[PDB]
């Protein structure tokens, strides 16, 4: 027997697209660094994305094995400061054991609108969860308030890329926000050049190190407006 609408794969670079501009990617870019597997299953792509990633990784204790994620298409890149809003909602859960992984938004920006979309002048991460001894790069900058919620801000370098990571003080399995609030904070408190940086990508997923786990994304939405 068989079924259509089959949007499941354990392939390194499997990608499924549909609904309002969503693509779900297995993205096992660091699979070389370990042993095991990563799979994704798309339940539904409409106005929202529903999907799950299932994985088991051992070895390469200190290396990300993958970033299975959902993201939105951005055919036309726009300047951060010109973008009106970047609303998003996320409803998710993690199951498994010995989880060394995170759950986070990931966005890249650059002054070059044709920059490759998987890196940039800057990277903005918003971590909704963290398991085990894994954390963002850089060093703690302190706690900040964005739209009435606390985040611990980290700041560091990857080569020439500057990375800002906003980490929730406890797991947030159910969230709603606007990434514009985070850019505004960086612009007004950190000298982030919002007037000259283009949003290259807008992703949400998990970075697994080791363990065995299933990230279930009950629902995710995101868009870039005006």
Q: Which of 1, 3, 11, 123 is catalytic?
A: 123
Domain ranges of the chain: 1-226
Query: Residue 136 corresponds to which tokens in the numbers above?
Result: 């963002």
Beta strands at 22-25 and 149-158: parallel, antiparallel or unpaired: unpaired
Do 121 and 197 meet the contact criterion of CB atoms below 8 Å apart? yes
Query: Cβ contacts of residue 196 below 8 Å, gap of 6+?
Result: 79, 111
Beta strands at 87-110 and 69-72: parallel, antiparallel or unpaired: unpaired
CATH superfamily membership of 1-226: Glycoside hydrolase family 11/12, catalytic domain (2.60.120.180)
Instruction: Look at the alpha carbons of 72, 75, 77, 81 in this order and tell me if their dihedral is positive or negative.
Output: negative
Q: Identify the burial level of 6 via C-beta atoms within 10 angstroms of its C-beta, where 0-12 means exposed, 13-18 middle and 19 or more buried.
A: exposed
Query: Residue 108 corresponds to which tokens in the numbers above?
Result: 């890249």
DSSP track, the chain: ---SS--EE--TT-EEEETTTEEEE---TTGGGSEEEEEEEEEEESSSEEEEEEEEEES-TTS-----EEEE--SS--BGGG--B-EEEEEEEEEEEEEEEEEEEEEEEESSTTS-TT--SEEEEEEEEEESS---SSEEEEEEEETTEEEEEEEEEETTEEEEEEE-SS--SEEEEETHHHHHHHHHHS---TTT-EE---EEEEEEEEEEEEEEEEEEEE--B-
The 10 Å CB-count burial string (b at 16+, else e) for 78-92 is: ebbeebeebebebbb
Query: Distance between CA atoms of 104 and 111, rounded to whole angstroms?
Result: 24
Q: Centre a 10 Å sphere on the Cβ of residue 173 and count the other Cβ atoms it contains.
A: 14
Do 16 and 42 meet the contact criterion of CB atoms below 8 Å apart? yes
For residue 72, give the nearest of 48, 37, 53 by alpha carbon: 48
Q: Centre a 10 Å sphere on the Cβ of residue 218 and count the other Cβ atoms it contains.
A: 16
Query: Cβ contacts of residue 83 below 8 Å, gap of 6+?
Result: 180, 199, 224, 225, 226
For residue 165, give the nearest of 148, 147, 185 by alpha carbon: 185
Torsion of CA 171, 73, 112, 31, to 10 degrees: 60
Looking at the DSSP assignment, which residues form a beta bridge with residue 69? Answer: 25, 205
Q: How was this entry determined?
A: X-ray
For residue 106, give the nearest of 38, 12, 201 by alpha carbon: 201
Q: Is 123 part of the annotated catalytic residue set?
A: yes
Query: Distance between CA atoms of 213 and 100, rounded to whole angstroms?
Result: 9
Q: Centre a 10 Å sphere on the Cβ of residue 167 and count the other Cβ atoms it contains.
A: 21
Q: Centre a 10 Å sphere on the Cβ of residue 116 and count the other Cβ atoms it contains.
A: 11
For residue 130, give the nearest of 187, 63, 183, 208 by alpha carbon: 208
Query: CB-side exposure of 20: number of CA atoms within 13 Å?
Result: 10
Torsion of CA 119, 122, 128, 132, to 10 degrees: 70
């Amino acid at each position: 027997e068989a079924e259509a609408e089959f949007q499941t794969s354990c392939e390194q670079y499997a990608v499924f697209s549909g609904g309002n501009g969503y693509s779900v990617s297995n993205n096992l870019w660091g699979q070389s660094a370990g042993s095991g597997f990563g799979c994704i299953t798309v339940n539904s792509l409409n106005s929202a994305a529903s999907w799950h990633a299932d994985w088991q990784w051992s070895g390469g204790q200190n290396n990300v094995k993958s970033y299975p994620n959902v993201q939105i298409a951005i055919p036309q890149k726009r300047i951060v400061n010109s973008i009106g809003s970047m609303p998003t909602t996320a409803s998710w859960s993690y199951t498994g054991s010995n989880l060394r992984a995170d759950v986070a938004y990931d966005l890249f920006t650059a002054s070059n609108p044709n920059h490759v979309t998987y890196s940039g002048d800057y990277e903005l991460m918003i971590w909704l969860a963290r398991y085990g001894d894994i954390g963002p790069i850089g060093s703690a900058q302190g706690t900040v308030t964005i739209n009435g919620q606390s985040w611990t801000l980290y700041y560091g370098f990857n080569g020439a890329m500057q990375v800002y990571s906003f980490v929730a003080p406890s797991t947030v399995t159910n969230w709603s926000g606007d990434v514009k609030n985070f850019f505004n904070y960086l612009r007004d408190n950190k000298g982030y050049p919002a007037s000259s940086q283009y949003v290259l990508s807008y992703q949400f997923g998990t970075e697994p190190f080791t363990g065995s786990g299933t990230l279930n994304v009950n629902s995710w939405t995101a868009s870039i407006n005006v």
